[PDB]
Amino acid sequence: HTLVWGVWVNGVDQGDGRNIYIRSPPNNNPVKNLTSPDMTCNVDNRVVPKSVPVNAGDTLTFEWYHNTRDDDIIASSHHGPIAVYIAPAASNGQGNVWVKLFEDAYNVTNSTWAVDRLITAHGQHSVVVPHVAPGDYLFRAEIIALHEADSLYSQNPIRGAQFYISCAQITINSSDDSTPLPAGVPFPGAYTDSTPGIQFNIYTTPATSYVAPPPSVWSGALGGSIAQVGDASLE
Numbered sequence: 001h002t003l004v005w006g007v008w009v010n011g012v013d014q015g016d017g018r019n020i021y022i023r024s025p026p027n028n029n030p031v032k033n034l035t036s037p038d039m040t041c042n043v044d045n046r047v048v049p050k051s052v053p054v055n056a057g058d059t060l061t062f063e064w065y066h067n068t069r070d071d072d073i074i075a076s077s078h079h080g081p082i083a084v085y086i087a088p089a090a091s092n093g094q095g096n097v098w099v100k101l102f103e104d105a106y107n108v109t110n111s112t113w114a115v116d117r118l119i120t121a122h123g124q125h126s127v128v129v130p131h132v133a134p135g136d137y138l139f140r141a142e143i144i145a146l147h148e149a150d151s152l153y154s155q156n157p158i159r160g161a162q163f164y165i166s167c168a169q170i171t172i173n174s175s176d177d178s179t180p181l182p183a184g185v186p187f188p189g190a191y192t193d194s195t196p197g198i199q200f201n202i203y204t205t206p207a208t209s210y211v212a213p214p215p216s217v218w219s220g221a222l223g224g225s226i227a228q229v230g231d232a233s234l235e
């Protein structure tokens with residue numbers, strides 16, 4: 001159970017984004033129904049009043065929390081991957097529009113899941129703003145908790161992979177458009193009962209064998225990190 005509090009741009013906190021520039025759902029419960037319209041941007045997808053200004057190449061940092069800012073972030077049970085997708089804002093997230101900018105699943109070097117490192121990073125993970133056409137975008141940050149993913153939700157609705165999905169409104173101002181955004185995947189649609197990485201038993205299957213759900217990271221993506229960029233405690 002986790003939510004986005006806000007974003008940082010180049011290590012500068014943009015402030016509380018909840019229901020302001022984040023299309024915040026009413027609570028931190030996961031989406032689990034892979035065919036749900038809730039897979040797009042969680043249960044309360046609507047235009048919120050503010051879009052955060054960035055330029056291509058900026059570091060954009062998502063900041064997650066559990067109950068209060070800079071707390072335990074997410075229950076340590078919730079091992080799994082983190083991804084970030086981008087879609088033009090006019091799509092409202094509908095259709096074949098979601099392009100993956102970031103994937104981090106299980107790090108063999110470190111022996112840790114992305115979520116383990118997200119807790120260490122005080123809820124912070126970052127992407128480099130890609131060189132797409134200037135305009136309004138949705139940045140869909142997605143944590144999959146796999147602690148109950150041995151079952152399909154479709155076979156047992158009390159279990160299944162848990163999607164923590166947050167859509168941030170980001171306006172890209174300065175961009176040379178060196179990597180124009182292609183068509184992407186639909187949410188719901190991209191993940192099905194047969195997709196690799198949706199059904200996974202962390203109790204019996206080694207994390208070293210985990211394959212995160214496609215699609216692959218787009219060739220236009222410039223990278224990211226799971227690391228604390230800003231100290232909320234200094235504010």
Ligand SMILES: [Cu+2]
Nearest residue numbers: 001002075078
């Ligand atoms: Cu939870």
